[PDB]
Design an enzyme around this catalytic site. Structure first.
Site, PDB file in Angstrom:
ATOM      1  N   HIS A  23      -0.931 -18.631  10.345  1.00 20.92           N
ATOM      2  CA  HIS A  23       0.033 -18.365   9.328  1.00 20.92           C
ATOM      3  C   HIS A  23       0.448 -16.940   9.387  1.00 20.92           C
ATOM      4  O   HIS A  23      -0.127 -16.163  10.147  1.00 20.92           O
ATOM      5  CB  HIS A  23      -0.537 -18.650   7.914  1.00 20.92           C
ATOM      6  CG  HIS A  23      -1.744 -17.806   7.596  1.00 20.92           C
ATOM      7  ND1 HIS A  23      -3.024 -18.127   7.952  1.00 20.92           N
ATOM      8  CD2 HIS A  23      -1.815 -16.557   7.069  1.00 20.92           C
ATOM      9  CE1 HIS A  23      -3.835 -17.127   7.641  1.00 20.92           C
ATOM     10  NE2 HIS A  23      -3.108 -16.152   7.134  1.00 20.92           N
ATOM     11  N   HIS A  47       2.000 -13.318   7.014  1.00 18.58           N
ATOM     12  CA  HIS A  47       2.288 -12.616   5.824  1.00 18.58           C
ATOM     13  C   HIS A  47       3.527 -11.750   6.084  1.00 18.58           C
ATOM     14  O   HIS A  47       3.647 -11.212   7.218  1.00 18.58           O
ATOM     15  CB  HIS A  47       1.127 -11.676   5.350  1.00 18.58           C
ATOM     16  CG  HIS A  47      -0.147 -12.388   5.247  1.00 18.58           C
ATOM     17  ND1 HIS A  47      -0.605 -12.959   4.109  1.00 18.58           N
ATOM     18  CD2 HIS A  47      -1.047 -12.738   6.186  1.00 18.58           C
ATOM     19  CE1 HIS A  47      -1.770 -13.549   4.331  1.00 18.58           C
ATOM     20  NE2 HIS A  47      -2.054 -13.468   5.592  1.00 18.58           N
ATOM     21  N   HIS A  50      -1.769 -14.340  11.594  1.00 17.78           N
ATOM     22  CA  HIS A  50      -3.156 -14.552  11.584  1.00 17.78           C
ATOM     23  C   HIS A  50      -3.473 -15.883  12.219  1.00 17.78           C
ATOM     24  O   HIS A  50      -3.097 -16.938  11.716  1.00 17.78           O
ATOM     25  CB  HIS A  50      -3.737 -14.565  10.138  1.00 17.78           C
ATOM     26  CG  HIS A  50      -3.722 -13.224   9.545  1.00 17.78           C
ATOM     27  ND1 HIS A  50      -3.790 -13.002   8.179  1.00 17.78           N
ATOM     28  CD2 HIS A  50      -3.635 -12.015  10.141  1.00 17.78           C
ATOM     29  CE1 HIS A  50      -3.704 -11.724   7.952  1.00 17.78           C
ATOM     30  NE2 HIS A  50      -3.631 -11.084   9.139  1.00 17.78           N
ATOM     31  N   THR A  92      -8.226 -12.778   3.507  1.00 23.16           N
ATOM     32  CA  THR A  92      -7.330 -11.936   2.721  1.00 23.16           C
ATOM     33  C   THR A  92      -6.671 -12.654   1.596  1.00 23.16           C
ATOM     34  O   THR A  92      -5.894 -12.032   0.871  1.00 23.16           O
ATOM     35  CB  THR A  92      -6.311 -11.241   3.601  1.00 23.16           C
ATOM     36  OG1 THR A  92      -5.348 -12.200   4.065  1.00 23.16           O
ATOM     37  CG2 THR A  92      -6.896 -10.435   4.696  1.00 23.16           C
ATOM     38  N   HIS A 127       1.660 -20.272  -0.666  1.00 29.82           N
ATOM     39  CA  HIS A 127       1.218 -18.868  -0.378  1.00 29.82           C
ATOM     40  C   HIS A 127       1.727 -18.371   0.934  1.00 29.82           C
ATOM     41  O   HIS A 127       1.863 -17.149   1.157  1.00 29.82           O
ATOM     42  CB  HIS A 127      -0.292 -18.853  -0.341  1.00 29.82           C
ATOM     43  CG  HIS A 127      -0.927 -19.340  -1.572  1.00 29.82           C
ATOM     44  ND1 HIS A 127      -1.888 -20.310  -1.562  1.00 29.82           N
ATOM     45  CD2 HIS A 127      -0.748 -18.985  -2.860  1.00 29.82           C
ATOM     46  CE1 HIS A 127      -2.249 -20.582  -2.820  1.00 29.82           C
ATOM     47  NE2 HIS A 127      -1.651 -19.724  -3.628  1.00 29.82           N
ATOM     48  N   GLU A 137      -0.540  -6.873   6.417  1.00 29.60           N
ATOM     49  CA  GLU A 137      -1.752  -6.688   5.613  1.00 29.60           C
ATOM     50  C   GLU A 137      -2.531  -5.470   6.142  1.00 29.60           C
ATOM     51  O   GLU A 137      -2.735  -4.506   5.433  1.00 29.60           O
ATOM     52  CB  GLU A 137      -2.553  -7.979   5.611  1.00 29.60           C
ATOM     53  CG  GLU A 137      -1.851  -9.086   4.832  1.00 29.60           C
ATOM     54  CD  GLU A 137      -2.708 -10.138   4.341  1.00 29.60           C
ATOM     55  OE1 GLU A 137      -3.564 -10.643   5.092  1.00 29.60           O
ATOM     56  OE2 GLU A 137      -2.481 -10.505   3.149  1.00 29.60           O
TER      57      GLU A 137
HETATM   58  O1  MNP Z   1      -6.486 -21.296   1.916  1.00 24.85           O
HETATM   59  C1  MNP Z   1      -6.844 -20.061   1.770  1.00 24.85           C
HETATM   60  O2  MNP Z   1      -6.071 -19.183   1.399  1.00 24.85           O
HETATM   61  C2  MNP Z   1      -8.209 -19.524   2.133  1.00 24.85           C
HETATM   62  C3  MNP Z   1      -8.153 -19.215   3.605  1.00 24.85           C
HETATM   63  C4  MNP Z   1      -8.261 -20.168   4.653  1.00 24.85           C
HETATM   64  C5  MNP Z   1      -8.198 -19.918   5.957  1.00 24.85           C
HETATM   65  C6  MNP Z   1      -7.914 -18.595   6.369  1.00 24.85           C
HETATM   66  C7  MNP Z   1      -7.836 -17.593   5.433  1.00 24.85           C
HETATM   67  N1  MNP Z   1      -7.675 -16.237   5.842  1.00 24.85           N
HETATM   68  O3  MNP Z   1      -7.742 -15.284   5.061  1.00 24.85           O
HETATM   69  O4  MNP Z   1      -7.332 -15.952   7.048  1.00 24.85           O
HETATM   70  C8  MNP Z   1      -7.910 -17.901   4.048  1.00 24.85           C
HETATM   71 ZN    ZN Z   2      -3.596 -14.261   6.603  1.00 27.79          ZN
END
Ligand code: MNP
Ligand code: ZN
Length: 257
Positions: A91, A93, A116, A195, A61, A103
């Site tokens: 992470h 997006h 994030h 999200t 993802h 986002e």
């Molecule tokens: O594994 C996952 O997608 C769930 C998850 C885990 C940690 C942070 C998240 N976020 O939206 O910032 C989402």
């Molecule tokens: Zn995120």
């Protein structure tokens, strides 16, 4: 299972995760003219001098830069927050093109990407307990625009070749997330959600006003990642963003005039 396609993307998530249509979903569009300055908000305290990154992960993802959260080593406090929130992972997006990827949006503007930094409230003991609470997480969101390279990001970019496909990880020690921060800590804040599924309504969002700049080359390397596992049909990891959700009965507050 859920993803970011036609058949499994955001617009489908509510079937397995009905909280997708809840009252405090994220992201949102930040309408700068209606976010009110709140003089009672504090400066944010970002204390990442002892952060201990351990590993980078392609989870199918996104990719996660993971931290040792077994002690108070990298913490977020102040701002809108009560108490202490420990960094567990960051992470991003991002888009297929520079014109989308974020986002959150700012007056409907989409940035090329959004970082994030995810933190959990120490009063709940562990992440899994924290996500069950409305004040369980604090996510620091930072927009990326394409321009000058971000020197501090380059360590991350150069490891991505080793985690091309879903389920790959690699040692990733000694990475300093301070290199990902903009000069100002001016922010907007509001109550929202994860999200990605399970979309839990456990987050105090803190979205910085000032984007970071990364180079086209850097973002292009994000877009060479794959959603698929080794050896399966290649589907580039791009457009792994949830669009803005209804604000409903929420106020977005600004830390700055
Ligand atoms: O594994 C996952 O997608 C769930 C998850 C885990 C940690 C942070 C998240 N976020 O939206 O910032 C989402
Ligand atoms: Zn995120």
């Amino acid at each position: 299972h859920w993803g970011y396609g036609k058949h499994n993307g955001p617009e489908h998530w509510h079937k397995d995760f009905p909280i997708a249509k809840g009252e405090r979903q994220s992201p949102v569009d930040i309408d700068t003219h209606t976010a009110k300055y709140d003089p009672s908000l504090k400066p944010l305290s970002v204390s990442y001098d002892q952060a201990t990154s351990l590993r980078i992960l392609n989870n199918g993802h996104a990719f996660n830069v993971e931290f040792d959260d077994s002690q108070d080593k990298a913490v977020l406090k102040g701002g809108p927050l009560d108490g202490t929130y420990r960094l567990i992972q960051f992470h991003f997006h991002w888009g297929s093109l520079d014109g989308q990827g974020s986002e959150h949006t700012v007056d409907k503007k989409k940035y090329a990407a959004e970082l994030h930094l995810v933190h959990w409230n120490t009063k709940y003991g562990d992440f899994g307990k924290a996500v069950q609470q409305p004040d369980g997480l604090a996510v620091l969101g930072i927009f990326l625009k394409v321009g000058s390279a971000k020197p501090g990001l380059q360590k991350v970019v150069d490891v991505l070749d080793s985690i091309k496909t879903k389920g790959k990880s690699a040692d990733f020690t000694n990475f300093d997330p301070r290199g990902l921060l903009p000069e100002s800590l001016d922010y907007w804040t509001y109550p929202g959600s994860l999200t990605t599924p399970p979309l839990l309504e456990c987050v105090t969002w803190i979205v910085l006003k000032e984007p970071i700049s990364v180079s086209s080359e850097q973002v292009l390397k994000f877009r060479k990642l794959n959603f698929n596992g080794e050896g399966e049909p290649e589907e580039l990891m791009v457009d792994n963003w949830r669009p803005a959700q209804p604000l409903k009965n929420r106020q977005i507050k600004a830390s700055f005039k």
